[PDB]
Amino acid sequence: SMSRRRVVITGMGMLSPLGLDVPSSWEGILAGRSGIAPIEHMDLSAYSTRFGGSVKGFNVEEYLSAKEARKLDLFIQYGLAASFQAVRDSGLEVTDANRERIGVSMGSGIGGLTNIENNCRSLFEQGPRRISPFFVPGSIINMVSGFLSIHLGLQGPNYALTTAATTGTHSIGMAARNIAYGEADVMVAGGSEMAACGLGLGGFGAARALSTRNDEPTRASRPWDRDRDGFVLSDGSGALVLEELEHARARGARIYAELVGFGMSGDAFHMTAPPEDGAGAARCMKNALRDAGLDPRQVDYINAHGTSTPAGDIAEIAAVKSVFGEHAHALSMSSTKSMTGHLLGAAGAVEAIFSVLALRDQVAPPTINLDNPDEGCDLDLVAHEAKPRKIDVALSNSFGFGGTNGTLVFRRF
Amino acid sequence: SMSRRRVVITGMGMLSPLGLDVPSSWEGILAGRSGIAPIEHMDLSAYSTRFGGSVKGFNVEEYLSAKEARKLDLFIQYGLAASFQAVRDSGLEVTDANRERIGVSMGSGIGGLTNIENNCRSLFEQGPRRISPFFVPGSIINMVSGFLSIHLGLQGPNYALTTAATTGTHSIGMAARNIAYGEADVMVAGGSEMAACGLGLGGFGAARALSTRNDEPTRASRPWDRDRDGFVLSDGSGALVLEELEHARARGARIYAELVGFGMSGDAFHMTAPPEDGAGAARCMKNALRDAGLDPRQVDYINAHGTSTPAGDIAEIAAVKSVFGEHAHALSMSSTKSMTGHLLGAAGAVEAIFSVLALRDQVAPPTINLDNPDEGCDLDLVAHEAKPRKIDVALSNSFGFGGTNGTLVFRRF
Ligand SMILES: C[C@H](CCC(=O)O)NC(=O)c1cc[nH]n1
Ligand SMILES: C[C@H](CCC(=O)O)NC(=O)c1cc[nH]n1
Ligand SMILES: [Cl-]
Ligand SMILES: [Cl-]
Ligand SMILES: [Cl-]
Ligand SMILES: [Cl-]
Numbered sequence: 064s065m066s067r068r069r070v071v072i073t074g075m076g077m078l079s080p081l082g083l084d085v086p087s088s089w090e091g092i093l094a095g096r097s098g099i100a101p102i103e104h105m106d107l108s109a110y111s112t113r114f115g116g117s118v119k120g121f122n123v124e125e126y127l128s129a130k131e132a133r134k135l136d137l138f139i140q141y142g143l144a145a146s147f148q149a150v151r152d153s154g155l156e157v158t159d160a161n162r163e164r165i166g167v168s169m170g171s172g173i174g175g176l177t178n179i180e181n182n183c184r185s186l187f188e189q190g191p192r193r194i195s196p197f198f199v200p201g202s203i204i205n206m207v208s209g210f211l212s213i214h215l216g217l218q219g220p221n222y223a224l225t226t227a228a229t230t231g232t233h234s235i236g237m238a239a240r241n242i243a244y245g246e247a248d249v250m251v252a253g254g255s256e257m258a259a260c261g262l263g264l265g266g267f268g269a270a271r272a273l274s275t276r277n278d279e280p281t282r283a284s285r286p287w288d289r290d291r292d293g294f295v296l297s298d299g300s301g302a303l304v305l306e307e308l309e310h311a312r313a314r315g316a317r318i319y320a321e322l323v324g325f326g327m328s329g330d331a332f333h334m335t336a337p338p339e340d341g342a343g344a345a346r347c348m349k350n351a352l353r354d355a356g357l358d359p360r361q362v363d364y365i366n367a368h369g370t371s372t373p374a375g376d377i378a379e380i381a382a383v384k385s386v387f388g389e390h391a392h393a394l395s396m397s398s399t400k401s402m403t404g405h406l407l408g409a410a411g412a413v414e415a416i417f418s419v420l421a422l423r424d425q426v427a428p429p430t431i432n433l434d435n436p437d438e439g440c441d442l443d444l445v446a447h448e449a450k451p452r453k454i455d456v457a458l459s460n461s462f463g464f465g466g467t468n469g470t471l472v473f474r475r476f
Numbered sequence: 477s478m479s480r481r482r483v484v485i486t487g488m489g490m491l492s493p494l495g496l497d498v499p500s501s502w503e504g505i506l507a508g509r510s511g512i513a514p515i516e517h518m519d520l521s522a523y524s525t526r527f528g529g530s531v532k533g534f535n536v537e538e539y540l541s542a543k544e545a546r547k548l549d550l551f552i553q554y555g556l557a558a559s560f561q562a563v564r565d566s567g568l569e570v571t572d573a574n575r576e577r578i579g580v581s582m583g584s585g586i587g588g589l590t591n592i593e594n595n596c597r598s599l600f601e602q603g604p605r606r607i608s609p610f611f612v613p614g615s616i617i618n619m620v621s622g623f624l625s626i627h628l629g630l631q632g633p634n635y636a637l638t639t640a641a642t643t644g645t646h647s648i649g650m651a652a653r654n655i656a657y658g659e660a661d662v663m664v665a666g667g668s669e670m671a672a673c674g675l676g677l678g679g680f681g682a683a684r685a686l687s688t689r690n691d692e693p694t695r696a697s698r699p700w701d702r703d704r705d706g707f708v709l710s711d712g713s714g715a716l717v718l719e720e721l722e723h724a725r726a727r728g729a730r731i732y733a734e735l736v737g738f739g740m741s742g743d744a745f746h747m748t749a750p751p752e753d754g755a756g757a758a759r760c761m762k763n764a765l766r767d768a769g770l771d772p773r774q775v776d777y778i779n780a781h782g783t784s785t786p787a788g789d790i791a792e793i794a795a796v797k798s799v800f801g802e803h804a805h806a807l808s809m810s811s812t813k814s815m816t817g818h819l820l821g822a823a824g825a826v827e828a829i830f831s832v833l834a835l836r837d838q839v840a841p842p843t844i845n846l847d848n849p850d851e852g853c854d855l856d857l858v859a860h861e862a863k864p865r866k867i868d869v870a871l872s873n874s875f876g877f878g879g880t881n882g883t884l885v886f887r888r889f
């Protein structure tokens with residue numbers, strides 16, 4: 064704990080509704096662009112929600128051969144894309160000397176819902192003889208970590224989290240712990256999701272979790288706005304190359320930031336709804352700050368969970384107020400879900416990247432669509448437009464079904 | 477690493493094809509009873525495999541009210557059952573003083589395949605308005621950890637692994653790390669699975685992973701036997717209460733054993749097939765022994781992965797030979813999958829329990845059906861009948877799709 068190794072971010076990668084890499088996504092974020100649109104090439108006329116954030120124009124053949132790619136669900140494709148981008152971005156070379164010290168932890172919330180839909184259809188219409196032989200290996204959540212390790216020869220710790228909307232945040236935090244306690248020197252960590260099929264929209268629609276603002280998809284995700292009506296379902300991926308500091312310094316790696324804190328908590332409250340005061344979120348953020356050895360006054364920017372739900376958004380404000388007190392009125396906090404929608408198991412991965420870039424570029428991304436902040440939402444929520452400011456420390460929150468909570472703390476380096 | 481806290485097992489719980497708790501399962505194991513039978517209340521006439529290990533006579537109402545239980549997929553039901561059994565067995569009392577120091581890590585390989593099947597059927601026949609509102613929260617893998625935390629008021633680290641057949645082993649190992657590095661004082665860890673639906677049998681059947689010995693289901697699982705033809709799909713759950721040693725001693729807990737070692741590796745080889753020498757398994761077992769600070773000569777019993785696959789079984793023997801050398805001929809190694817079949821994400825959880833009970837009762841469980849050991853399978857594989865012997869250290873292996881590997885080391889206490 065006092066003798067643990069320090070962990071830095073040397074590589075990043077992303078597919079989002081705003082772009083096919085980190086630079087293009089971030090340009091969208093800093094412009095206040097929505098990635099949400101009507102979902103195409105899919106007949107959603109029966110569904111109460113017919114829009115979301117899709118990854119537009121993705122070519123898996125930049126990362127995999129066609130033959131390899133056809134084995135895999137889109138969530139795996141997306142996770143490999145972000146991973147390969149992050150590894151490349153890191154400049155790391157995998158050798159016989161280091162391959163056992165490099166692991167992977169790429170998770171998903173829902174996994175291969177699209178493959179399950181297609182295979183279920185084949186099963187019901189034709190029978191079990193039309194199930195793909197790649198159905199199981201190409202749809203299971205740990206096959207990002209698995210295929211990444213195969214393709215790059217990674218022999219270190221190899222696993223996958225699934226903690227709903229918290230997955231990406233946990234995947235990064237726990238990979239950092241791996242490095243900090245010397246179980247690995249490098250980890251590829253993050254997550255991916257592709258739930259914009261009928262089971263996903265249908266499932267989340269039946270749970271009454273989604274916005275139904277079909278007439279104005281770009282206005283649907285509106286965190287802390289009084290006309291919010293639930294979250295927007297989005298697809299994509301994020302990956303970070305985490306690396307022990309001295310390992311990174313020794314090879315002259317470009318270091319984007321230091322991952323100084325990781326906190327976890329459980330609400331122990333409700334399956335899908337938070338406690339109204341956000342007490343689990345508060346405990347989680349405290350754990351993270353204490354983990355980082357930071358005073359709350361050192362936090363400059365919070366990338367909120369901020370999913371555009373009635374209860375969730377207000378609970379998150381209550382938690383930030385509780386943890387930060389008067390300093391809650393000094394920091395900036397925004398929800399990039401206003402633009403990206405909710406990427407579920409990838410949300411914390413892409414939001415970790417946006418947090419790192421906020422530190423790099425000294426700029427708080429906007430919460431777009433925040434026209435009439437609800438009762439109690441009186442913080443600097445960066446309404447409408449990106450805000451240049453001093454950011455030495457950034458915090459990223461994720462909260463998921465089951466009351467599972469994760470916070471990461473990043474520090475300028 | 478040198479200053480980490482020690483971790484002991486103070487509670488255990490299980491549903492398996494051999495019983496509805498730990499004592500009844502273990503009685504079956506020590507008798508050499510098969511849990512495999514034709515799967516009933518399910519029309520499998522179109523499928524190439526029509527048998528498996530089902531949990532027979534389970535009453536979820538012993539653990540949950542009917543109202544709560546109807547929200548949840550069977551895999552969640554099974555995981556809560558084992559968890560509640562383990563917590564009860566531990567004698568731990570959850571209070572305002574300790575609830576933030578008690579977490580949960582219960583995983584699954586496949587998750588709520590049964591719920592997805594049912595909901596997919598409703599979606600296709602009727603439309604998205606017949607999807608259950610509980611479909612998403614009651615089918616996602618992290619809802620064991622989530623519901624357990626809600627029901628028992630656990631506010632500590634709350635997560636879920638999904639690493640195929642390795643899930644249960646990773647869930648225990650990583651929960652132990654939580655305690656060892658002081659992120660929690662107690663963890664409920666393990667896994668659960670219920671894949672014996674059509675998508676599971678169909679999926680694994682299309683992948684050519686399963687035995688098709690429909691005429692003699694009890695003979696199908698035959699690890700290291702020359703007539704093996706793939707694994708047997710089984711359902712169930714296992715949970716351990718892990719606890720910091722001084723915490724357990726201070727409350728006078730009954731301690732079953734000490735969890736001394738956890739190792740991970742990745743093969744970085746093939747999606748579904750191992751390297752023929754089992755080199756990943758070897759690295760993993762070495763990592764675990766080094767983690768435990770044990771000489772290979774200290775291992776008395778190995779609970780093998782031993783799934784009854786052509787390549788897998790031989791690769792595991794090669795790995796044990798490589799790691800243990802001449803001591804490979806001194807230990808006993810058995811596969812309890814001979815009796816239980818392959819519980820997928822729960823396999824390592826139930827096999828951790830069988831390893832702990834081997835230490836408690838000084839007895840190596842049998843590998844039943846091992847009539848003609850294949851070329852190279854010349855170890856003490858405990859063919860046919862349980863073998864009383866000295867066991868101070870037991871090792872449990874799990875290997876999963878993606879080449880992800882896990883080993884746990886338990887020591888008498
Ligand atoms: C239970 C919800 C999960 C959010 C999601 O599905 O992404 N949690 C919150 O909304 C929340 C707010 C503050 N703390 N938890
Ligand atoms: C790739 C397989 C996974 C086994 C399973 O699906 O449960 N791995 C082995 O069989 C194996 C044997 C030795 N090392 N890995
Ligand atoms: Cl298909
Ligand atoms: Cl619009
Ligand atoms: Cl239904
Ligand atoms: Cl039989």
